């Protein structure tokens, strides 16, 4: 199991005078931070969200983001004027993964109107191949900012893996927690004329990895349709698995659920 840290920024520029920037951080599947345009601070969502950082460290990290947010939206408005761009959706996805064998990696990807345009590579900003020409002009300006460049490297190479190591420790018990799902069957819409839709709902499990198949005893029905894994408000997950059978094929059929919290005691519901 892996717990990368992904820091996500959503900056929306409706025109030259109206803009919002909002952020959040994820460790693995769990949201640890929330960063609101209304707020003067990034909010720790968990008792362990601060990692092993000192209060004085967190505060200057708060300061860094606070000035980052201000001049980022300053700078975006400049480039939009400079490069004659029409009104704007920017997204940032930055963070890192800790691998105890030195194979530790990090990333800082920026997207414009939903498309990758540039990322941080080694030491400087680098455009992607498919990005428009004009992005080249902006990277010429960005790479003249040696302090922003030195700081981004410190955050990626230094602050981030330090932070992830502290979060893995101070949040150890919640990360390893197991919550058992419940399941229930229901009749879905008639898919055809002589057909009935068997529906197996599975809700309440954590963490995310799960296995749900319709079965006739031990014969896994290849017709099993697994839904998306959808989130509940309490950080568990929900899953719908559907089967299209003929009028009389329903009887004798069972939904099987295997999850890391059950300890081999699968859930099995017979139709």
């Amino acid at each position, epitope marked *: 199991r892996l717990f990368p840290l992904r820091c996500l920024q959503i900056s929306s520029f409706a025109n030259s005078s109206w803009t919002r920037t909002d952020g959040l951080a994820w460790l693995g599947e769990l949201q640890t931070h929330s960063w609101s345009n209304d707020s003067d601070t990034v909010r720790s969502l968990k008792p362990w969200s601060q990692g092993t950082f000192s209060d004085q460290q967190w505060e200057t990290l708060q300061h860094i983001f606070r000035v980052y947010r201000s001049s980022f939206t300053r700078d975006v408005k400049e480039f939009a004027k400079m490069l004659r761009l029409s009104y704007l959706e920017l997204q940032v996805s930055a963070g890192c993964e800790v691998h105890p064998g030195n194979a530790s990696n990090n990333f800082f990807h920026v997207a414009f109107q939903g498309k990758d345009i540039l990322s941080f590579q080694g030491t400087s900003w680098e455009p992607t191949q498919e990005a428009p020409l004009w992005v080249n002009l902006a990277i010429q300006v960005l790479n003249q900012d040696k*302090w922003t460049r030195e700081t981004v*490297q410190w955050l990626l190479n230094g602050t981030c893996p*330090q932070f992830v190591s502290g979060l893995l420790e101070s949040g150890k018990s919640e990360l390893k927690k197991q919550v058992k799902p419940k399941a229930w069957l229901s009749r879905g819409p008639s898919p055809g004329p002589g057909r009935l839709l068997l529906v197996c709902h599975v809700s309440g499990f954590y963490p995310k990895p799960v296995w749900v198949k319709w079965m006739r005893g031990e014969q896994e029905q290849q017709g099993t349709q697994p839904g998306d894994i959808l989130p509940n408000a309490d950080e568990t997950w929900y899953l719908r698995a559907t089967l299209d059978v003929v009028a009389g094929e329903a009887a004798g059929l069972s939904c099987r659920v295997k999850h890391s919290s059950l300890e081999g005691q699968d859930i099995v519901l017979y139709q």
Partner: T-cell receptor, first 108, second 111 residues
Framework: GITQSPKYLFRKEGQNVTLSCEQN?????MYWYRQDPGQGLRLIYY???????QKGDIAEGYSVSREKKESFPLTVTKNPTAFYLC???????????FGPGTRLTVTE | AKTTQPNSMESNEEEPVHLPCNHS???????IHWYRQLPSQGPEYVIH???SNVNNRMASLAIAEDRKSSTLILHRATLRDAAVYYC?????????????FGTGTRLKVLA
């Protein structure tokens, strides 16, 4: 960058003296170090920013002032003779820059 | 967190020199700085790194894999490189401005 006039400074015991440090570049933090022959640098006084200054491990006997951001004067008033080095600091990655140093000898 | 260096070191001219430094309690956000003080002069910045090896024109910094030790490497020492070399940690957060130096390594370069 950093100026320390003059290179050499001589004074008789029990007389007070103030060595100058003038920097032209725009650095907030300033430092005074003291070095004895064949010895390492020992920090006297540092000023993270104007009107502020904190005492290093051997400020006993020394006084300092930070009224402008381009100037940081050290004043001596037990073993005053030594090599006195002034430094400035930039932001991350926080490299230090040093004056050419002033030589101070105090005679009985 | 402090650093440790041998007191003195000798090396022949026109050979590379590996100057060692130990910093076992270093943290992920600590930079490693190296300074050089020629006789009668003020220290001079030489190089700094965080997590990757660094190459300037005359000197490189090799950082161990656990970041617990490091090496300043003069690519080719000449007589003029006789100096005291200081290996320092600099907190990347920028909290304490109590910037202090150890004793460093006095390098002698032999003809």
């Amino acid at each position: 960058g950093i100026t320390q006039s003059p290179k050499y400074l001589f004074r008789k015991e029990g007389q007070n003296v103030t060595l100058s440090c003038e920097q032209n570049l725009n650095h907030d933090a300033m430092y005074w170090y003291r070095q004895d022959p064949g010895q390492g640098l020992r920090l006297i006084y540092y000023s993270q920013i104007v009107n502020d200054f904190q005492k290093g491990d051997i400020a006993e006997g020394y006084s300092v002032s930070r009224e402008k951001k381009e100037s940081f004067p050290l004043t001596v008033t037990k073993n005053p003779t030594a090599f006195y080095l002034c430094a400035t600091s930039v932001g991350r990655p926080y490299e230090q820059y040093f004056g050419p140093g002033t030589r101070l000898t105090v005679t009985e | 967190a402090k650093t440790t260096q041998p007191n003195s070191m000798e090396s022949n001219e026109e050979e590379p020199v590996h100057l060692p430094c130990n910093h076992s309690t270093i943290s992920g956000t600590d930079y490693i700085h190296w300074y050089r003080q020629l006789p009668s002069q003020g220290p001079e910045y030489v190089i700094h790194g965080l997590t990757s090896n660094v190459n300037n024109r005359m000197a490189s910094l090799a950082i161990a894999e656990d970041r617990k030790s490091s090496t300043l490497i003069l690519h080719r020492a000449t007589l003029r490189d006789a100096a005291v070399y200081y290996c320092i940690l600099r907190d990347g957060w920028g909290g304490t401005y109590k910037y202090i130096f150890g004793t460093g390594t006095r390098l002698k370069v032999l003809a």
